Amino acid sequence: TLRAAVFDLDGVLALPAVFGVLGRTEEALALPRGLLNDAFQKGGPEGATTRLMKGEITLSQWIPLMEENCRKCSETAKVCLPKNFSIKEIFDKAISARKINRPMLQAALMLRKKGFTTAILTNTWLDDRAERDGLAQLMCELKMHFDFLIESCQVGMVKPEPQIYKFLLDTLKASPSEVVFLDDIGANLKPARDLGMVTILVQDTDTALKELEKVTGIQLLNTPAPLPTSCNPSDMSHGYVTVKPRVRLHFVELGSGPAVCLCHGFPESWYSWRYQIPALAQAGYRVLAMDMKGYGESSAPPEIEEYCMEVLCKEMVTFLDKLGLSQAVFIGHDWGGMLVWYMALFYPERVRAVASLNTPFIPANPNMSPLESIKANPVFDYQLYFQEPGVAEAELEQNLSRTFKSLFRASDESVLSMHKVCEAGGLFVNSPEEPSLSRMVTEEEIQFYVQQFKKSGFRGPLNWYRNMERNWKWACKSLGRKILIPALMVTAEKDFVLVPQMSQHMEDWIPHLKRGHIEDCGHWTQMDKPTEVNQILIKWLDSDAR
Amino acid sequence: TLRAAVFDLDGVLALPAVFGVLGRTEEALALPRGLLNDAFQKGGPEGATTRLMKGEITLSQWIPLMEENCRKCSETAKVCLPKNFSIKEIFDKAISARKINRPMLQAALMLRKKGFTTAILTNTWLDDRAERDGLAQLMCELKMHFDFLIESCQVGMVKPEPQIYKFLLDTLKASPSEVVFLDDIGANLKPARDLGMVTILVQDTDTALKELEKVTGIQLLNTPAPLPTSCNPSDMSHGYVTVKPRVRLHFVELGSGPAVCLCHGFPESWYSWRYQIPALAQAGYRVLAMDMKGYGESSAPPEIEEYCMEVLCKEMVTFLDKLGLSQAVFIGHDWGGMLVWYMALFYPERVRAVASLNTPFIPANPNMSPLESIKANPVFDYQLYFQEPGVAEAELEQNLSRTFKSLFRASDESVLSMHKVCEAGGLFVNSPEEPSLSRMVTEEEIQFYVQQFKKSGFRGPLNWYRNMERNWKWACKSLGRKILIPALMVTAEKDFVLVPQMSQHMEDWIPHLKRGHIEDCGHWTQMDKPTEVNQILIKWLDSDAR
Numbered sequence A, B: 001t002l003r004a005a006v007f008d009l010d011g012v013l014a015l016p017a018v019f020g021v022l023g024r025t026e027e028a029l030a031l032p033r034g035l036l037n038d039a040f041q042k043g044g045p046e047g048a049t050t051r052l053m054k055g056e057i058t059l060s061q062w063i064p065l066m067e068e069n070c071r072k073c074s075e076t077a078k079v080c081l082p083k084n085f086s087i088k089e090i091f092d093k094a095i096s097a098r099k100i101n102r103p104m105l106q107a108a109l110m111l112r113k114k115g116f117t118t119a120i121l122t123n124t125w126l127d128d129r130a131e132r133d134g135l136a137q138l139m140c141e142l143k144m145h146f147d148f149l150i151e152s153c154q155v156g157m158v159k160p161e162p163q164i165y166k167f168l169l170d171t172l173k174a175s176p177s178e179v180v181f182l183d184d185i186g187a188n189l190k191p192a193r194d195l196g197m198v199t200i201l202v203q204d205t206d207t208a209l210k211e212l213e214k215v216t217g218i219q220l221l222n223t224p225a226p227l228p229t230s231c232n233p234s235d236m237s238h239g240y241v242t243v244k245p246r247v248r249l250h251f252v253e254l255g256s257g258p259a260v261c262l263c264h265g266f267p268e269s270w271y272s273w274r275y276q277i278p279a280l281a282q283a284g285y286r287v288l289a290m291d292m293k294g295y296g297e298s299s300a301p302p303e304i305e306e307y308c309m310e311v312l313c314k315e316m317v318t319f320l321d322k323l324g325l326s327q328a329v330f331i332g333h334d335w336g337g338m339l340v341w342y343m344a345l346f347y348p349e350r351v352r353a354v355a356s357l358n359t360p361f362i363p364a365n366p367n368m369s370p371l372e373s374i375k376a377n378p379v380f381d382y383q384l385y386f387q388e389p390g391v392a393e394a395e396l397e398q399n400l401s402r403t404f405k406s407l408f409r410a411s412d413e414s415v416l417s418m419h420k421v422c423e424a425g426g427l428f429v430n431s432p433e434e435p436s437l438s439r440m441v442t443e444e445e446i447q448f449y450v451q452q453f454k455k456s457g458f459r460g461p462l463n464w465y466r467n468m469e470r471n472w473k474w475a476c477k478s479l480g481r482k483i484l485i486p487a488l489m490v491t492a493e494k495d496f497v498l499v500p501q502m503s504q505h506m507e508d509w510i511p512h513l514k515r516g517h518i519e520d521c522g523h524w525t526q527m528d529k530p531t532e533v534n535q536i537l538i539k540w541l542d543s544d545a546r
């Protein structure tokens, strides 16, 4: 029956309410109780505050009217305002004190996710204050989670007037009884209740959610921890840079602040960072999530040497040159992780800081060809399989859905061993035709990867493994250097290929290395443990990259 | 005969040379003359400094070797180093003191422009210092102007070794006598001279340029002021954002720092900002140059109301939402200028600051339909011509090269009046079939616009003029507000349509308005007077947007 949920902002999605601050200021300053609220409401429908809420005037224009209203209320109550009495001040402090009320947002999310239409309905203002950006950020964070945000000052109408409710019902394409509306102000619910909307008077958050649960019949309170925000591909800004004539790089870009360049592994995609992108943007970074060379919408030339580490690094440098970035933070996973260490080693001036998921830094052995070194560790055998052009391509392209569903699995869901892959004659020889869906991924997400890899297949991606000798020789030029820029190594407990112990000597070459460690985390770190990855990255960025 | 020019960096393209600082430090600190230079050169080809210049070790690793070398030189000269003696300190100060030597760069540019291949050949290091970004910026600014930058630490070879010269000749695809090489160090010229290169020992900049001029036969010294750096379309990062299902916006993106969104007028393109984009990036801004709705690679739906100012503004807001920008600076010219004022009026929270070229802010008259207001000013008659769907499209599309060559003219080159356009029956009725090329634009630049407008023609662009009544009604909601965010109005003396006097009352509605004024500047402000536009914008950004 209920098909939509509408949330007030002040006192419902954002806390403390600002009327909250009018009460406290009065008391703090020992004024007559409600004086500030009387000055605020003065003139009712024709007073300064309604003009503000309707968008007739801006917040900077209203500030001095509210002042006058405060003088008038104080003369009529026969008191004096203190020296230094400042409406601008009180409101600045009140607006910056209000934060997102997380459990209300998470209930709104859950309702959206079971197919509700959701909106925010708020009496708010055109904010031209010096400090306006703080509230602009808050509104951006909330708004991306709802179908509509309706602001009194944008539509020229205010709660409790009945026209904003008709405007509400009409934007929702729903009828009065299909709608629940939560607000902390009883007067605002009245007209909704009159048209026959379910309404909830919001005092403490928990009781409201209990009423919302009872009325919608969906579980909202005490729900398990939700995933971080993911990305919809078609809502992202997509960027394209030609680094040389045959070769363009594609990337998805979100956020502002220091540039952070995310470099995925094999066989992945910018989308492998879907859970990191909004979190790092929200944390104040400019995220740039690559399709690396060979993948997705980046170019995929056929030749093997287009994919040696030297060329790949030079082209990441060109990518920065053409974007006009003197530096970025480089964060890599798997093959991308190897590449970011080599960026730190060959272009420290271009790298603000470097971090790797799973891939350790282990200096080349100048007395052992890497092809030989690889034979000494049974879990790397899959790399030998990858050598012969064509063999891995045929298997991996043969059925794309099967390929990614077989690969993208949590550590207890595995369907293949990386073990005697050559002997067995394939990565999938003893795995199902139709694997079950890992808990880590939805069917839709698998089909994103399938559609990406339909553009170029596995030749470019596999070529990353086809330059052993060439990479070894390049790496050897670097054996006298150390990595002395800010660096983070994140190991994953249950990565049975890129095992945490392989990283054990990294402090020899990177003396100031910082670490995180994720327990119960397989090879696909970002989607296995997105919440922990986000927390470890954001903390290290804020302390070392800022 | 000469086909290439090679410039050293330290002491040639960048000044003061850092050997410069070794001399001064010695004297400042009353040490034995040359002690610091001896410590620096110690061990010659096998000493610490060569390892550094070859890329074997990083700058942070070399610092303490140089220290040791300074202790050793001082004991052998029988003196003591002062308390607080700091190699890191001296070098930090020396590196940040060096700036681009502008007249050498401009000579290099001119030589490139007459078809020389140009390169930088430098002994330099892998720079992992905390403060590395300063030099990274300097190298980015220089490098974008040359065919090659060859660094000793990237190629594993050093001047004066003869292999870097062979590596040089081979990268240039030229022979010894086709090459001029400028360096401030005589030893470096020797091997070039041995292979038969022209060389120039660089002491004072002017004498070197006089030698370079004499030898190349091109005028380099006392040349007129050059244009700002322009943009090559295919070297830019191109971004695409879907703001709603039928509609994507394209933009070119360069630089990092506060987002600055450039909004061109009619009938233009992101490319109309070609001279501003590198300058604002170089000044520390993140430039976003739009194709506005209806143009270039942005969507161009056919319906008129898709182009009213309300819709256009809402979609610029969505563009910010999807890019994750809580604000941008909005700078507009012509129609883009009108739009940025309306962004300031309806979304101040999203606008960090607002500036307009040519387009004034004049509040709507609520007692006169704008269609009528327009009839009262003969220079706006071209807007009436634009009203009837199809009529202007047929004329403007009929011959694209003629259209833009007729429009894009400096103030003394005009070939049409905006005067009785309806009566005459066309914008071009009394103008040439094949106009001559304005001094403002090359043939290639005209053909960029021609190819852009081949994608969608003039329907979307002309529709910006087709919502008078709708825009008037929207604007009237704003008649109580003022613009109180930071704002800049730049008038152009010889814009005979958007005349400077039309802006005269703007302080009534924008009390803190700042101004610039450009003399001898027609309607096409950015390409008419790019140098002055850049200076006025960069100065106002640095003081009000930062």
Ligand SMILES: O=C1CN(Cc2ccccc2)c2ccccc2N1
Binding pocket: A309, A338, A342, A364, A370, A383, A464, A465, A466, A467, A468, A471, A472, A475
């Ligand atoms: O394909 C490869 C390339 N190499 C050497 C290399 C050296 C330096 C940089 C990139 C690659 C490698 C080294 C270790 C494990 C696996 C591999 N697999």
Ligand SMILES: O=C1CN(Cc2ccccc2)c2ccccc2N1
Binding pocket: B309, B338, B342, B364, B370, B383, B464, B465, B466, B467, B468, B471, B472, B475
């Ligand atoms: O096409 C137009 C639209 N209007 C009104 C308008 C009002 C507000 C915002 C955009 C447009 C206009 C006003 C003045 C000069 C020329 C024009 N030409």
Ligand SMILES: [Mg+2]
Binding pocket: A008, A009, A010, A011, A012, A017, A183, A184, A185
């Ligand atoms: Mg409220």
Ligand SMILES: [Mg+2]
Binding pocket: B008, B009, B010, B011, B012, B017, B183, B184, B185
């Ligand atoms: Mg020099």
